[PDB]
Amino acid sequence: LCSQLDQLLQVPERRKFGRMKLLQFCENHRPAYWGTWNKKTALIRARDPWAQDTKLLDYEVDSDEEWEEEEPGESLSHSEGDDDDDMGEDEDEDDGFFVPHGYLSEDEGVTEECADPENHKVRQKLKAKEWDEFLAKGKRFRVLQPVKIGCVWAADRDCAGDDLKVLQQFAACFLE
Amino acid sequence: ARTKQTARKSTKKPHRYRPGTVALREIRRYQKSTELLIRKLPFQRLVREIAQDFKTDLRFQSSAVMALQEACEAYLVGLFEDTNLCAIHAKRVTIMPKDIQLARRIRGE
Amino acid sequence: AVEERVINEEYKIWKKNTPFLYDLVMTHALEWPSLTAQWLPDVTRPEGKDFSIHRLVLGTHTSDEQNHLVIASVQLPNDDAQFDASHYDSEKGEFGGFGSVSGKIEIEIKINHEGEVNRARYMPQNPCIIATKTPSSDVLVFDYTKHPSKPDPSGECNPDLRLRGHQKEGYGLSWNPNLSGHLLSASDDHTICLWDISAVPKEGKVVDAKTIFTGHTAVVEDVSWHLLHESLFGSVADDQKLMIWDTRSNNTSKPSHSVDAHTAEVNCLSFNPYSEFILATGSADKTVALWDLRNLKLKLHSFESHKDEIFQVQWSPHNETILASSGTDRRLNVWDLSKIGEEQSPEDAEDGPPELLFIHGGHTAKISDFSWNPNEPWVICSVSEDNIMQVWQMAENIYND
Amino acid sequence: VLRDNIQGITKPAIRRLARRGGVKRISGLIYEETRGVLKVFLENVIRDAVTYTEHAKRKTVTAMDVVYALKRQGRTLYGFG
Amino acid sequence: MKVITCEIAWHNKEPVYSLDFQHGTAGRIHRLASAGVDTNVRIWKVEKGPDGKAIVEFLSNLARHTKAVNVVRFSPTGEILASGGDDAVILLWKVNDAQLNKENWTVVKTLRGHLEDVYDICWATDGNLMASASVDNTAIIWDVSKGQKISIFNEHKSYVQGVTWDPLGQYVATLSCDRVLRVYSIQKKRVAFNVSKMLSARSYRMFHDDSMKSFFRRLSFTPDGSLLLTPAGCVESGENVMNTTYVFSRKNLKRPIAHLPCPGKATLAVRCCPVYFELRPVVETGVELMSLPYRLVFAVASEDSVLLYDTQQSFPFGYVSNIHYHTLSDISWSSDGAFLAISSTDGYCSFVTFEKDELGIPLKEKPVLNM
Numbered sequence A: 001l002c003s004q005l006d007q008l009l010q011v012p013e014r015r016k017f018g019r020m021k022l023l024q025f026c027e028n029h030r031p032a033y034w035g036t037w038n039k040k041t042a043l044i045r046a047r048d049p050w051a052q053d054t055k056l057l058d059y060e061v062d063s064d065e066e067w068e069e070e071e072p073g074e075s076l077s078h079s080e081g082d083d084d085d086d087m088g089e090d091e092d093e094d095d096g097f098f099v100p101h102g103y104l105s106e107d108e109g110v111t112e113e114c115a116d117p118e119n120h121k122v123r124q125k126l127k128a129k130e131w132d133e134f135l136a137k138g139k140r141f142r143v144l145q146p147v148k149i150g151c152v153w154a155a156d157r158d159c160a161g162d163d164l165k166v167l168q169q170f171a172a173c174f175l176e
Numbered sequence B: 001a002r003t004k005q006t007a008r009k010s011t012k013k014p015h016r017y018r019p020g021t022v023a024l025r026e027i028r029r030y031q032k033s034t035e036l037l038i039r040k041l042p043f044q045r046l047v048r049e050i051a052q053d054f055k056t057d058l059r060f061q062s063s064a065v066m067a068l069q070e071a072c073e074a075y076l077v078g079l080f081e082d083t084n085l086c087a088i089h090a091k092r093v094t095i096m097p098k099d100i101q102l103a104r105r106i107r108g109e
Numbered sequence C: 001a002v003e004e005r006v007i008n009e010e011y012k013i014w015k016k017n018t019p020f021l022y023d024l025v026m027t028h029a030l031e032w033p034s035l036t037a038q039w040l041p042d043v044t045r046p047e048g049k050d051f052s053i054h055r056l057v058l059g060t061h062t063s064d065e066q067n068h069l070v071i072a073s074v075q076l077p078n079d080d081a082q083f084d085a086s087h088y089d090s091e092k093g094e095f096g097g098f099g100s101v102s103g104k105i106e107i108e109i110k111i112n113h114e115g116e117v118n119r120a121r122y123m124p125q126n127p128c129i130i131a132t133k134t135p136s137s138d139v140l141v142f143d144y145t146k147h148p149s150k151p152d153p154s155g156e157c158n159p160d161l162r163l164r165g166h167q168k169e170g171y172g173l174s175w176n177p178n179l180s181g182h183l184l185s186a187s188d189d190h191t192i193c194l195w196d197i198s199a200v201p202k203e204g205k206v207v208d209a210k211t212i213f214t215g216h217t218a219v220v221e222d223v224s225w226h227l228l229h230e231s232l233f234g235s236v237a238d239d240q241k242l243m244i245w246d247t248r249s250n251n252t253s254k255p256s257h258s259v260d261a262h263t264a265e266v267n268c269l270s271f272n273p274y275s276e277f278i279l280a281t282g283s284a285d286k287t288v289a290l291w292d293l294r295n296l297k298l299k300l301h302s303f304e305s306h307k308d309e310i311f312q313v314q315w316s317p318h319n320e321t322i323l324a325s326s327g328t329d330r331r332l333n334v335w336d337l338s339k340i341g342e343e344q345s346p347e348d349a350e351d352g353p354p355e356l357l358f359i360h361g362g363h364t365a366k367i368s369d370f371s372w373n374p375n376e377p378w379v380i381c382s383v384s385e386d387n388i389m390q391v392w393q394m395a396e397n398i399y400n401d
Numbered sequence D: 001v002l003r004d005n006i007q008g009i010t011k012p013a014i015r016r017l018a019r020r021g022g023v024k025r026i027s028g029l030i031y032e033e034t035r036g037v038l039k040v041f042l043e044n045v046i047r048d049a050v051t052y053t054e055h056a057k058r059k060t061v062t063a064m065d066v067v068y069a070l071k072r073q074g075r076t077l078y079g080f081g
Numbered sequence E: 001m002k003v004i005t006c007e008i009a010w011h012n013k014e015p016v017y018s019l020d021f022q023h024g025t026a027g028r029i030h031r032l033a034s035a036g037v038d039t040n041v042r043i044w045k046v047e048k049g050p051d052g053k054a055i056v057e058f059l060s061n062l063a064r065h066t067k068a069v070n071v072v073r074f075s076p077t078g079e080i081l082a083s084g085g086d087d088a089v090i091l092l093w094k095v096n097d098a099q100l101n102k103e104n105w106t107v108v109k110t111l112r113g114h115l116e117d118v119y120d121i122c123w124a125t126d127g128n129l130m131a132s133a134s135v136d137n138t139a140i141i142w143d144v145s146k147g148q149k150i151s152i153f154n155e156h157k158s159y160v161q162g163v164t165w166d167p168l169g170q171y172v173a174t175l176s177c178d179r180v181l182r183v184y185s186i187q188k189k190r191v192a193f194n195v196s197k198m199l200s201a202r203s204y205r206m207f208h209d210d211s212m213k214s215f216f217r218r219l220s221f222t223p224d225g226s227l228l229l230t231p232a233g234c235v236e237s238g239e240n241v242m243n244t245t246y247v248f249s250r251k252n253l254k255r256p257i258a259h260l261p262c263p264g265k266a267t268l269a270v271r272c273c274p275v276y277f278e279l280r281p282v283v284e285t286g287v288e289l290m291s292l293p294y295r296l297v298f299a300v301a302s303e304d305s306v307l308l309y310d311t312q313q314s315f316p317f318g319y320v321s322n323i324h325y326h327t328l329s330d331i332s333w334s335s336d337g338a339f340l341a342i343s344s345t346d347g348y349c350s351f352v353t354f355e356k357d358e359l360g361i362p363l364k365e366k367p368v369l370n371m
Helices: A002-009 A099-109 A116-139 A161-169 B040-054 B062-089 B097-107 C002-021 D011-021 D030-055 D063-073
Strands: A022-024 A147-149 C022-029 C051-058 C067-077 C105-113 C120-122 C129-133 C139-143 C161-163 C172-175 C182-186 C192-196 C211-213 C220-225 C232-237 C241-246 C257-260 C266-271 C278-283 C287-292 C295-304 C310-315 C322-327 C332-336 C356-360 C367-372 C380-384 C388-394 E002-006 E016-020 E030-036 E041-048 E054-062 E069-074 E080-085 E090-096 E104-111 E118-123 E129-134 E139-143 E148-153 E162-165 E171-176 E180-185 E191-195 E197-199 E203-205 E227-235 E242-249 E258-261 E267-277 E295-302 E306-310 E318-321 E328-333 E339-344 E349-353
Touching: A002 C232, A099 A116, A147 A161, B040 B062, B040 D030, B062 B097, B062 D011, B062 D030, B062 D063, B097 D030, C002 C022, C051 C120, C105 C139, C120 C172, C129 C172, C182 C220, C182 C232, C232 C266, C241 C266, C257 C295, C278 C310, C278 C322, C287 C310, C310 C367, C322 C356, C322 C367, C356 C388, D011 D030, D030 D063, E016 E339, E030 E069, E030 E339, E054 E104, E054 E349, E080 E118, E080 E129, E129 E162, E139 E171, E227 E258, E227 E295, E242 E267, E267 E328, E295 E328
Parallel strands: A022 C022, C172 C220, C220 C266, C266 C310, E016 E069, E016 E328, E069 E118, E118 E162
Antiparallel strands: A147 E318, C022 C388, C051 C067, C067 C105, C120 C129, C129 C139, C139 C161, C172 C182, C182 C192, C192 C211, C220 C232, C232 C241, C241 C257, C266 C278, C278 C287, C287 C295, C310 C322, C322 C332, C332 C356, C367 C380, C380 C388, E002 E349, E016 E030, E030 E041, E041 E054, E069 E080, E080 E090, E090 E104, E118 E129, E129 E139, E139 E148, E162 E171, E171 E180, E180 E191, E197 E203, E227 E242, E227 E267, E242 E258, E267 E295, E295 E306, E306 E318, E328 E339, E339 E349
């Protein structure tokens, strides 16, 4: 390489329409356009982009008729509003909109045939589940792969022991 | 070298899909966005007040309230691109309240 | 007046005819014109999204305002989103739809810069470090990770490093893809400055002139490292001279090889990202000459399609045999090596030689700078002098047939 | 005192909803209409949920009532069933 | 056994809730109906493809529903179909002898009596008596022949998500969402059995409360009728409770014979294949749930998973999971049993194709049931 270099140196089908086409102009009041184009004219070529397109389209402005804005649009496009935010302080002592307070209100208003230690255990388990959900909220999107277990039977002994122990984990528990 | 120049200051409505050939797999729409983008407390106070308006001696859950939330903005976005398609068909880009009402009737609310 | 009107009408015609000739057009108008513009190797593809994100390093040309080095993040729709049947227009008979959801261009970080950024380039291995050229003799290095995102309220810039060896401004800067910290600089001082920043201390700010070349007798227009060679680079200057230097050579004044370029001054040079024996140089004589590194005496091919001086020439990380150049014609011309020596009808030849494949004349002003997207193929951003920045991509059938 | 929260809906929140749906131009007075549509749909939802919970013979409403109201009016809830 | 996720447009992405096969015809071809909130009842034709894949095609649509439908079940004859929506009305349909409907299906009867959203419907052992479940906390009885209300059971305190008819014709089993189970006589028309709590000997409720994120609590009698199956069970082995389903025999409807714990997700629907099979050769142990001269196989719908059990085995022989993104909605058995139609709440369905004899030999003569 270097040594030799030095030595020498010294609706219709989408597939029938083609690829999706997009165009956006900052200057247009016209909204950005995206659509598939299939019109075939030999007059509009890369060699002569500006050639007339007879019987194809009018060389007339459509952005102005598309959007003659002339309105208080607040210029939502950029540079304003995204960064603005406001904080506040609240009261949550009268009607508690919370897991512990909600559970307490539910248990006080509605009483069932459940032991108080059982109610405490259930509340703790529900709070733990909510906390685990909040922690797993950071997982966000997780692509999930399908799982399928075939017809494995006790008669067969050459089947995969992994699936065997997996289904053993799903045992049927009888009661006396 | 090169001559330079001074810069100038710079200033049909139900789109139901046919029973076949529809294998759309939008996964984002499955999972909750976890992006409230609403101030929780004006929402909460408003809900509390209208609830008192309807009935009294009642309690809520934060889960129920947040559920109310995503229901809100989900309906918002639904109506919202409905209004977008209307205004595009309405040959206009600035959104009018009549557009909201027309989309609302497109659903049939 | 007349020129402005004819350019406006030409642009209107191009605007009307672009649906048939382009697949991706993304135009924005800048606050200020940029002399520099380039991609980032990093791409952002968030899960659950129908779009991709890309990043851009540009500067500003302000006559009496604090010039800011700008990173711009740009939203690009996904390839998966490139095939979707949303709706159908009975009028146009296509799966069109104006809609409102589109990719957008966003400025992320602005860094104060002393004067206009003559040229901005970054580490080929570390987008954190970027080198900028100043109208002053100084050469400044900025790092977004090592600087607040918003530009400092103080007007004075805060360079992380300043490099010494040049006596005034210039328009040539390059980095070594194979060697870390190796900078090649060009200036009106008729000197070519080589600098190494890999050995700069953590708290160091001033970098000396590691190597100064003075073989050129005219204004060294541009300097660039070789894409594959670890010690070879070329230089182009106003003396219509194509000079080759070896850093291993013990003489910084005696060039490794001296071959004239054209009858007019040359502006830049470019090598293949894949090949290592062919380089492209643009000249003021409306010609771009190909040179085989096997023999520099005879030009491999001198393409001719412009009507004026050609400024910037760049090769393709996607396609080895694809080249385009832009100059004061405001026209960007895409050139293929597979059509070299191919017979064509005169109806396809009035415009020029069949060497050309495409022309981009969407520029109100002279095309300031362009860069080819290493991740997305055929994807190019170009900037005109009228703070006009578009991101564009031609029709797919013009190269894929 | 507790009757003047109709404007509690913030301009940043409404513009952010506008941004998610994809617009670039917004009306200036549309904001109160948005708040009113919000309010009516909120009310329909919550009253129907009350109908369930009362028919649930329950005091504190659950998000399950929210779900049933959602389907009764005719929309889908994802991840909560 | 192969599992096919159905990517096709079922109800243009609206979730499915109920589905049923055609019991009348034993042919390989099958007619399938589905329930969704589009207020649209869509008939689909399914059969095994040349590759054995369960490929489906649309047949006809019903759009009279002003409101969403929840439960859809054919007659045992299958000639007449029961349709139930939120609009608090149930219509009966029969095929009649249009661009997208190959056949027209017409309302035959107009039955009301639940003035609320409807959750469940049940056919009699003959298709002439009707059972239905709704929001209204009410158990109704209808005569298909005359199409008028005959019985109302108001004993429930919460919602009722599952009703079933004794194939023998002597019992009607109903559950409340209040973790309360009731069995009703036919001649007596009263609460024959009522079980909510069980002593171990600490006593606790066996079924899940309203706190569950499940919408349906479907269950079915065994086609033999000697075994009763109840999903959404709670087993408190220790300080915690765990999901399970209970199995009941005609000997005692108070104490179930046993239960099937289901770690993780919660059961919501229980269905039994209407075909019988020979006793599979196995060691003579207590593994089998019930000792019967002929075996039967059934499917159970959990929150996400479906599990397959037979008469001889306690552990599930067929296990499927992680197929539908949302929670499950309904499960249906083909008349031949070769097609097991899986419907969830995501918006799609899925199929598991069964090869002939893969589940044993169907009985040459179907054993009679003592009425």
